[PDB]
Subunit: 244 residues, 3 copies
């Protein structure tokens, strides 16, 4: 018998799913956080553990939904160079043994522009542009890579993207601090993957974050950046504490 408001019973698939996406408050061994970008975004600097960071007067457009993409944050450049939006978390809490997995549902802009730089992975925070590691998107080209002190230390082959298209990217932290990134179509079909040779860019302080960052490299406004529907964080953690 199925559980009721007055009498106990079994748990439905819908209740199981709900529980699977519950944001961690007090941790034991698993960490989960996700945000679906449905909230009014004026002055919104975090949600469900995730930092939502605007710099350089980046233009967060009106929230919309399209098709199955519920809550979408479109992003437009400003007159300040390096303006960015970052949805991410601190690296200090996800050491290599946590095997953090980050999943991002994102839409390419309606026109590519050489000024567009997006990363799914680790990155310098804010207006910074010197360090990143994961799936990098410059203009219409996606590729796995590492950038350190503004130098490309490692670069995979490129996958050319289409404008106004929904994509999924999974970033996977490996136990030696290397990473694997996988790009999928909106139906989950694998399109591209890259596994790093060297360890990811890491800073275990607030100069860096891990997640999604989209940025305009020039000081011209009105350039569309990458829109975000959904981000998910999952990791294994050590959080066994004495109960009193």
């Amino acid at each position: 018998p199925l559980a009721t408001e007055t009498t106990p019973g079994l748990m439905s698939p819908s209740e199981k799913l709900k529980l699977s996406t519950l944001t961690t408050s007090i941790a034991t061994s698993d960490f989960y956080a996700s945000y679906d970008f449905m909230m009014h975004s004026i002055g919104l600097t975090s949600a469900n553990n995730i930092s939502l960071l605007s710099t350089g007067n980046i233009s967060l457009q009106n929230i919309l939904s399209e098709g199955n993409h519920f809550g979408v944050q479109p992003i437009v450049s400003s007159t300040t160079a390096n303006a960015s939006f970052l949805a991410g978390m601190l690296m200090a809490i996800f050491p290599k043994e946590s095997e953090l997995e980050v999943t991002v549902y994102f839409k390419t802009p309606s026109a590519f522009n050489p000024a567009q730089l997006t990363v799914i992975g680790s990155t310098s925070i804010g207006l910074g542009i010197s360090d990143r590691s994961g799936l990098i998107i410059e203009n219409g080209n996606a590729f796995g890579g590492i950038v350190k002190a503004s130098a490309a230390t490692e670069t995979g082959s490129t996958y050319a993207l289409s404008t106004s298209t929904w994509y999924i990217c999974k970033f996977k932290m490996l136990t030696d601090d290397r990473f694997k990134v996988t790009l999928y179509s909106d139906s989950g079909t694998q399109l591209y993957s890259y596994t790093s040779t060297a360890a990811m860019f890491r800073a275990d302080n607030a100069t860096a974050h891990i997640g999604f960052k989209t940025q305009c490299k020039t000081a011209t406004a009105g350039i569309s950046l990458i829109s975000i529907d959904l981000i998910e964080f999952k990791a294994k953690v050590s959080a066994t504490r004495a109960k009193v």
Copy 2:
């Protein structure tokens, strides 16, 4: 430590879980128990102060756990809004908003409260749902500062707890129902035309109480609890 049945309280907990990743439905609620200095949102819901509105100390009262009293400032059109964006709630979503609220000790012609859609912040040009002007609750639609539809009025009791349910219909018409704190229907209104809707940040749907005048000290409508319940089509590929 052993897998078993799900408790009725556990299922009740899950039933009011604030949506993180949407699949089939949306839910959000806020019970106003948090320290309110610099609090601009909770549980997906916007908590918007404008015109230097005076948010009084949080209190509880009987079974009304967590109550936000609100008082006017010296800025005309000052308001507090607890709400969400309409763009995420199209007519198919069939959105339902429930508000537990308390009328002030004294009514005032400067008080304007809306449960439904409304101009954001200092705006007064557009609203649809249950409109409270002075002591009078009525269903209605206002667009560009003019009434387009107005139901009969209901005289509310001062210092009294009410419940309002706003229902979005699948054709974007609405129905509003006012209950007493006992849960018995006191007043209802079903709209003829479609509600006021703006699918951008110039509007919100939820609860808004406002002072139309620049006189401070006027108590507006206090809020205990707001609830958002909707249907969503949000199936994305798992990877």
Copy 3:
């Protein structure tokens, strides 16, 4: 895809779900893993910085996942407070607060930490619960800038993880218990008089660490985790 049993893992997650819409219970916890810039609340809990207090980088240590270290500024009475309003925990709620915290590498007479009720922010006039001054923990009450009641002191060790449980009694008295990181009880105090209570925004209940002097660079007490559990009167009419 098919209905069935609930796992122990699922049962555990639901047990520590942060209360949204209340019925008979309240729970909130925060584990200090978030980027702290501009962060003033999380999971119902106020996270308050005053006097330009220096929040260090979030770290984790052993099984202490998400830790917020805290350092003094040039403002006397600069503090960090993780807590909630007292109006929402009347004496009948029997609130229980649990704090996991680490002492600094060096004690200093300027260090003042409270688990329990306290003046907010730069305030230092009122507190009750487990008070830590310099290297000494003790149960006690201070009101209007004067001790009213003071338990025996217990000498803490530097760079050491501790747990404190604060328990609200039905007559508004309190019991505090101090534990080792493995959960061995080390100290307890049960008050004779009622706790410090102010049911407004001049006070909070939870954790507060403060530097009494205008000298920067003095480490205060780090916090890993805070929990709030209580009974609530929130049975209201449905629909």
